[PDB]
Amino acid sequence: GDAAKGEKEFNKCKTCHSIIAPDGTEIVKGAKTGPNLYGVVGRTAGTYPEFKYKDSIVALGASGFAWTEEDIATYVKDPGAFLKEKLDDKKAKTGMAFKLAKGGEDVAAYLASVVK
Ligand code: HEC
């Protein structure tokens, strides 16, 4: 995907999220309302350190759910619904009170590029 467009598009992502360098330097000085996305790619979702997740997203992760580029790209288009679906649960609420039926694709590539 267009990692460059992903980077630009990240202007929205960072409203809640951020991206951190391996050493801890706050590269994307965004918010920390959502789990800092650096290294989301391949991660077992709800398990990033120092982040107050919910039961749903954590359980999804615990069920052996890993964030692929595809999954990430899809998620942003239908968060909450994604959880509800894959967890086969009704009460699978998400903190992400935001959706976007675009960006996901390029942003996923950007995240994949960023995990260095
Ligand atoms: C503010 C509201 C936003 C915006 C604009 C975006 N996200 Fe995203 N996000 C947000 C919260 C509060 C949470 C936590 C969910 C929970 O219930 O705990 C999330 C979570 C994610 C995740 C999950 C990652 C993980 O499991 O560790 C992904 C993936 C994710 N959000 C990605 C993402 C992208 C690519 C965005 C770009 C526009 C984006 N979010 C925006 C809150 C918010």
Curated annotation (Swiss-Prot):
Gene Ontology molecular function terms on file: electron transfer activity; heme binding; metal ion binding
Which GO terms fall under biological process for this protein?
photosynthesis
Q: Which residues form a coiled coil?
A: none
Q: Does the keyword Nuclease apply?
A: no
PTM per UniProt?
Answer: Binds 1 heme c group covalently per subunit.
What UniProt keywords apply to this chain's record, in alphabetical order? Electron transport, Heme, Iron, Metal-binding, Photosynthesis, Signal, Transport
Binding residues for heme c? 13, 16-17, 96
Question: What role does it play?
Answer: Cytochrome c2 is found mainly in purple, non-sulfur, photosynthetic bacteria where it functions as the electron donor to the oxidized bacteriochlorophyll in the photophosphorylation pathway. However, it may also have a role in the respiratory chain and is found in some non-photosynthetic bacteria.
Name the record gives this protein: Cytochrome c2
Instruction: Please report the organism this UniProt entry assigns to the protein.
Output: Rhodobacter capsulatus (strain ATCC BAA-309 / NBRC 16581 / SB1003)
Q: What stretch of the whole protein does this chain cover?
A: 22 to 137 of 137
